[PDB]
């Protein structure tokens, strides 16, 4: 009704607030973030530089898909980092094309501050074509997986270069079985309190990625290309994570809640680092 | 602001409240909403018992979107589909503006819908930044040689012809005729005068500026604005205006609008009206 009073459709999301139907046209969803209204934002980055997490673009792209009946995120490549400076407000736009005749829509995420030019930070494809989801869990912790000591894992990433403040220090337990890694990940109470409003809170899905850096440790490397991403259940505060390599050279991830019920499936996640590297 | 909290830009206008820049190489869309409850003058323009959004409202919408992209001049606008206002149901408005070409010209379109109906395009045209060199403010008012006209029965005549002009749209107060030219003074009712400052030009004021042109032709039948060319708004928020209408060689009318001190307000190079088919938008009258 805020949005409705402007002639648009209200969106009830912590980061997106209005939907603008274009008349073939497609659709645009808009929103505004900052470290005042999303304090967890200040806890993710590279050194002193803050970066909107890759998992936030996944959350945004899936939520736009929900609005057009295309919840499956078939593909998503991340292009430019979204540097957030201080408590500057950041305008967000998620642009969704009309459906092609193959059913697929293109999705894009743009952002800017002030009147500086918009920059495209994410681009991919949305569909309603769904893959059959991975079965639910049973035995936890999984049989034959050895418990790993992550007691000081966030310090190993603190001097490697990663910038994970308290909201993104989610990894609590991990195990290794062969090339598989298992993990328990949970939000702090502050982000836990907001979690119910998201598809999957961006800080929780990011921290679900942290245990993959246990099997093979490569400097700083961040999610880059996602493939076959489906959110299965919403509002999670704590999750279990099952990560495996693909023979495509990437990582599969199957996310469940504390009862083993599916939360999220990621068919493949490629990550990449980055003149001169850091140390 | 409201629009700011949604990640958009606010627009301060009575009918449009938000500007959404479309990054990519697309342009802009401005959005708003209207209803007889928030815009009571809507109820006072139509044909028969059918409330119709005034074509001048589309001129106002298109020009306001032009200002938002630094393209203030309405080079051309064609009205495509009438917009019926059904009771007090709200109407969603969208004004789409393209990226400028190499010419510096932008395409503009106005869409509307109520409830969950599909959008309908009501107006399409072209904005430019090119301004016309202004027309002379030469003032004896009224001009020499102009003969006063009794307009006391004018709106009663227009009613009998078929026009539906309620109180907010009965702004024609005085008129003079010289050759095939008409001069008019037009004033908003107090209710519309109070909100006129926020408009580029109140749609009810611009529409009544068109009422004096029928005094020469005395056309049988109802006709509504259809095509506009060279619409420049030179001064915003007028309540009372002077009007100078004359034909062009197109079968069209030009109009130059000044304020009550003779200063420029708006210029319309060409306006074409089109006859309304009996039985099109309201029922036909009953034969006698």
Phi, psi of B91 (to 5 degrees): -120, 125
3 state DSSP class of A145: coil
Distance from C-alpha of B211 to C-alpha of B262, rounded to nearest angstrom: 20
Q: Cα–Cα–Cα angle for B167, B171, B175, nearest 5°?
A: 140
Q: What sign results for the dihedral spanned by CA atoms B237, B241, B247, B253?
A: positive
Residues of chain B with Cβ-Cβ distance to A8 below 8 Å are 6, 18, 31, 92
A206: annotated active-site residue:
yes
Option in B4, B22, B33 nearest A28 (CB): B22
DSSP-assigned letter for residue A166: G
Q: Cα–Cα–Cα angle for A64, A70, A75, nearest 5°?
A: 80
Tokens of B237: 């928020």
Kindly determine whether residue A7 and residue B31, on different chains, have CB atoms separated by under 8 Å: yes
Kindly determine whether residue A22 and residue B8, on different chains, have CB atoms separated by under 8 Å: no
Residues of chain B with Cβ-Cβ distance to A7 below 8 Å are 17-18, 31-33, 92-94
Of residues A13, A38, A43, A44, which has the active-site annotation? A44
Nearest CA in chain B to A116: B23
Beta strands in chain A (DSSP E): 9-10, 18-21, 27-33, 44-46, 49-51, 72-78, 83-84, 90-96, 105-112, 119-127, 146-148, 162-164, 171-177, 180-186, 221-231, 238-245, 251-256, 262-273
Nearest CA in chain B to A117: B23
Distance from C-alpha of A69 to C-alpha of A74, rounded to nearest angstrom: 14
Nearest CA in chain A to B13: A6
Alpha-carbon distance values, A97 to A13, A108, B230 (Å): 20, 9, 34
DSSP string, A82-131: -EE-TT--EEEEEEEPPP-TTS-EEEEEEEESTTSPPEEEEEEEEES--P
B45: annotated active-site residue:
yes
Q: Which of B27, B39, B128 is nearest to B83 (CA)?
A: B39
Of residues A121, A206, A254, A257, which has the active-site annotation? A206
Distance from C-alpha of A115 to C-alpha of B242, rounded to nearest angstrom: 40
B265/chain A closest Cα distance in angstroms: 29
Alpha-carbon distance values, B241 to A151, B170, B173, B202 (Å): 78, 14, 10, 11
Q: Which of B236, B229, B244 is nearest to B265 (CA)?
A: B236
Distance from C-alpha of B164 to C-alpha of B120, rounded to nearest angstrom: 23
Residues of chain A with Cβ-Cβ distance to B121 below 8 Å are 23
DSSP-assigned letter for residue B250: T
Q: Which of B81, B134, B112, B125 is nearest to B228 (CA)?
A: B125
Topology of A1-279 in CATH?
A: Thiol Ester Dehydrase; Chain A (3.10.129)
**Which residues, at least 6 apart from A232, have a Cβ–Cβ distance to it below 8 Å?**
A133, A255, A262, A263, A264, A265
Q: Which of A186, A195, A200 is nearest to A229 (CA)?
A: A200
Cβ–Cβ contacts within 10 Å for residue A224, how many?
Answer: 17
> What's the CA dihedral at A170, A176, A179, A180 to 10 degrees?
-60
Q: Cα–Cα–Cα angle for B5, B8, B11, nearest 5°?
A: 100
Nearest CA in chain B to A89: B7
Asked if B179 and B63 count as a contact pair (C-beta separation under 8 A), the reply is no
Distance from C-alpha of B81 to C-alpha of B63, rounded to nearest angstrom: 19
Distance from C-alpha of B111 to C-alpha of B90, rounded to nearest angstrom: 14
A26/chain B closest Cα distance in angstroms: 12
Final resolution, Å: 2.0
- Residue B33 belongs to what H/E stretch? strand B28-34
B122/chain A closest Cα distance in angstroms: 12
Distance from C-alpha of A123 to C-alpha of B7, rounded to nearest angstrom: 19
**How was this structure obtained?**
X-ray
Tokens of A263: 């939360």
- Residue A203 belongs to what H/E stretch? helix A202-208
Kindly determine whether residue B8 and residue A18, on different chains, have CB atoms separated by under 8 Å: yes
Tokens of A7: 């002639």
Option in A7, A18, A21 nearest B33 (CB): A7
Q: Which of A163, A205, A212 is nearest to A187 (CA)?
A: A205
Distance from C-alpha of A244 to C-alpha of A241, rounded to nearest angstrom: 10
Asked if B19 and B30 count as a contact pair (C-beta separation under 8 A), the reply is yes
Distance from C-alpha of A200 to C-alpha of A194, rounded to nearest angstrom: 10
Kindly determine whether residue B6 and residue A108, on different chains, have CB atoms separated by under 8 Å: no
Domain ranges of chain B: 1-288
- Count CB pairs under 8 A between chains A and B: 81
Tokens of A137: 């869990």
CA count, 13 A, side-chain hemisphere, A163:
15
Of residues B202, B207, B211, B256, which has the active-site annotation? B207
Option in B6, B23, B121 nearest A3 (CB): B6
Kindly determine whether residue A32 and residue B6, on different chains, have CB atoms separated by under 8 Å: yes
CATH 3.10.129.110 fits B1-288, yes or no: yes
Residues of chain B with Cβ-Cβ distance to A92 below 8 Å are 7
Tokens of B212: 């004096």
Distance from C-alpha of B41 to C-alpha of B169, rounded to nearest angstrom: 8
Of residues B13, B39, B45, B244, which has the active-site annotation? B45
Distance from C-alpha of B6 to C-alpha of B12, rounded to nearest angstrom: 16
């Amino acid at each position: 009704s805020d949005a409705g009073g402007l002639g648009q459709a209200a969106v009830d999301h912590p980061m997106l607030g209005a939907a603008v139907e274009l008349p073939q046209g497609g659709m645009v969803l808009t929103g505004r973030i900052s470290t005042t209204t999303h304090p967890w934002l200040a806890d993710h980055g590279v050194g002193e530089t803050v970066l909107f997490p890759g998992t936030g673009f996944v959350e945004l792209a899936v939520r736009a898909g929900d609005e057009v009946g295309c919840p499956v995120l078939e593909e998503l490549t991340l292009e430019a980092p979204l540097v957030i400076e201080g408590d500057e407000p950041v305008q967000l736009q998620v642009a969704v094309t009309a459906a092609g005749e193959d059913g697929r829509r293109e999705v894009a995420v743009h952002a800017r501050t002030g009147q500086r030019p918009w920059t495209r930070h994410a681009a991919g494809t949305l569909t309603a074509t769904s893959s059959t989801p991975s079965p639910a869990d049973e035995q936890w912790p999984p049989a034959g997986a050895a418990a790993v000591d992550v007691s000081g894992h966030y310090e190993a990433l603190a001097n490697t270069g990663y910038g994970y403040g308290p909201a993104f220090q989610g990894l609590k337990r991990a195990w290794i079985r062969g090339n598989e890694v298992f993990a328990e990940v949970e939000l702090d109470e502050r982000e836990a309190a907001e979690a119910g409003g998201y598809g999957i809170h961006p800080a929780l899905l990011d921290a679900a990625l942290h245990a993959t850096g246990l099997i093979e440790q490569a400097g700083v490397a961040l999610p880059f290309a996602w493939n076959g991403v489906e959110l299965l259940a919403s509002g999670a505060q704590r999750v279990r994570v099952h990560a495996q390599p693909t023979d495509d050279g990437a990582t599969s991830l199957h996310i469940t809640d504390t009862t083993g019920a599916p939360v999220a499936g990621i068919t493949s996640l490629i990550s990449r680092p980055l003149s001169r590297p850091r140390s």
